[PDB]
């Protein structure tokens, strides 16, 4: 049939920040995952519910690509379990995950000489997240026992906080761009699948 846009998901100039990860439904395609797996540009390419070399020959109901940017150190946090700050308060992967995770270092796009403070991640949430929960609202948080009516005094904090992202940062503190594909292996009529 016709190809589908992996180009505008991987050749993306602007990747959304992690607390507001960007989701995209791609369908009605002939998807060639050989391009991704044969590309050496990635650092982590980990498929969970399938085998990465057998992705050409299946057929999927709908495939969703999530996209964001995180610190290089904690790209481990992206797993079906694997609790942690982004893994719990920011991006929650369901345990029964059937998809793939791709992450590559992008220190030369996201980290500027003065330091990039436009990338924010959420901290101090009242509770964890549902799997695949997008939470763009950041009201004032309550930490101690005060009434947080727009105040920020010593016990009423703001949830968002910035990464450093300087070119001098260590190999683990550099930004990594993450795109995670989740497949709907349902037996509805197929819409997206390779040759």
């Amino acid at each position, epitope marked *: 049939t016709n190809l589908c846009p992996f180009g505008e998901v991987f050749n993306a*100039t*602007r*990747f*959304a*920040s992690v*607390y*507001a990860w*960007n989701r995209k439904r791609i369908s009605n395609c002939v998807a060639d995952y050989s391009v991704l797996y044969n590309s050496a540009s990635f650092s982590t390419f980990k498929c969970y519910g399938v085998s990465p070399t057998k992705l050409n020959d299946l057929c999927f109901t709908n495939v969703y690509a999530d996209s964001f940017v995180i610190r290089g150190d904690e790209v481990r946090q992206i797993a079906p379990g694997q609790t942690g700050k982004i893994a719990d308060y920011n991006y929650k992967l369901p345990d029964d995950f059937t998809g793939c995770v791709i992450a590559w270092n992008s220190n*030369n*796009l*996201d980290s*500027k*000489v*003065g330091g*990039n403070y*436009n*990338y*924010l991640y959420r901290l101090f949430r009242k509770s964890n997240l549902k799997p695949f929960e997008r939470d*763009i609202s950041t009201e004032i948080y309550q930490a101690g026992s005060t009434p947080c009516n727009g105040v920020e005094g010593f016990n009423c904090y703001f949830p968002l906080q910035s990464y450093g992202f300087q070119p001098t940062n260590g190999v683990g503190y550099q930004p990594y761009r993450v795109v995670v594909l989740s497949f709907e292996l349902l037996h509805a009529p197929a819409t997206v699948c390779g040759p």
Partner: antibody, heavy 123, light 114 residues
Framework: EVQLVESGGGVVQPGRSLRLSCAASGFTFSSYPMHWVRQAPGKGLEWVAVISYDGSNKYYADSVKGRFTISRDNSKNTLYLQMNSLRAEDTAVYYC????????????????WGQGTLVTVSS | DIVMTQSPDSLAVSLGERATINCKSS????????????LAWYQQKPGQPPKLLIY???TRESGVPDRFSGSGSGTDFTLTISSLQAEDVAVYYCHQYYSTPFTFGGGTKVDIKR
């Protein structure tokens, strides 16, 4: 203040190859990307290329991709653009133009422009 | 890519009157991780390099009279000139800076109505 002066340019023949250079002063030339913007007489501005502050990533336009090559000599504080296989539609006024890194990623909008050259294509 | 359409072509207005130019992008140039709106508004006098007038589609560049104002969001934006003077006969350009390649608009030769 930043002073950008665009050298080179003038007269070319169809199929010739030319080389423009912007000499910039007033700021750290190695910590700001740079753009080229073409403007054919009386038509309107059009993007051409872009660089990154360490001279690694280079993105072009659609009607140029594979014809021009844009490099950047940090040591001499200069920006070079090599034009190859010029067609009759490439006569225009070329502006160098300095970025201002505020956008989330590297490439961002452009704020300070330089006086234009007069690349003219006809034999 | 993302293509900008800027309307109208000529916008003739007499002094003291208002004015409004509009621009529509093919896709939605609106970053969401911040609430910033990647788009900018330049102007050009005849025979000079352009200037910057609006960035983030609303803010103003230092050194610009209050008479200009950029409004809009998503994929619809407008530059509003409240009052007109002698030094506002110039062709105005829109310019996204979301996805490479960047793109400009066709212009708007804001003349003087007499």
């Amino acid at each position: 203040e930043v002073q950008l002066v665009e050298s080179g340019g003038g007269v070319v023949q169809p199929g010739r190859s030319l080389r423009l250079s912007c000499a910039a002063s007033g700021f750290t030339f190695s910590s700001y990307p740079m753009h080229w913007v073409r403007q054919a007489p009386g038509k309107g501005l059009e993007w051409v290329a872009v660089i990154s502050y360490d001279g690694s990533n280079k993105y072009y336009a659609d009607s140029v991709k594979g014809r021009f090559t844009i490099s950047r000599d940090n040591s001499k504080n200069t920006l070079y653009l090599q034009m190859n296989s010029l067609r009759a539609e490439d006569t225009a006024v070329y502006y160098c133009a300095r970025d201002t890194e505020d956008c989330s990623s590297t490439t961002c909008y452009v704020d300070y422009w330089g006086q234009g050259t007069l690349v003219t294509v006809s034999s | 890519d993302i293509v900008m359409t800027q309307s109208p072509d000529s916008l003739a207005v007499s002094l003291g009157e208002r004015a409004t130019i509009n621009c529509k992008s093919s896709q939605s140039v609106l970053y969401r991780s911040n609430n910033k709106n990647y788009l900018a508004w330049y102007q050009q006098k005849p025979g000079q390099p352009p200037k910057l007038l609006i960035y983030w589609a609303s803010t103003r560049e230092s050194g610009v009279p209050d008479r200009f104002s950029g409004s809009g969001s998503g994929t619809d934006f407008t530059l509003t000139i409240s009052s007109l003077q002698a030094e506002d006969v110039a062709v105005y350009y829109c310019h996204q800076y979301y996805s490479t390649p960047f793109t400009f608009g066709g212009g708007t030769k804001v003349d003087i109505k007499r």
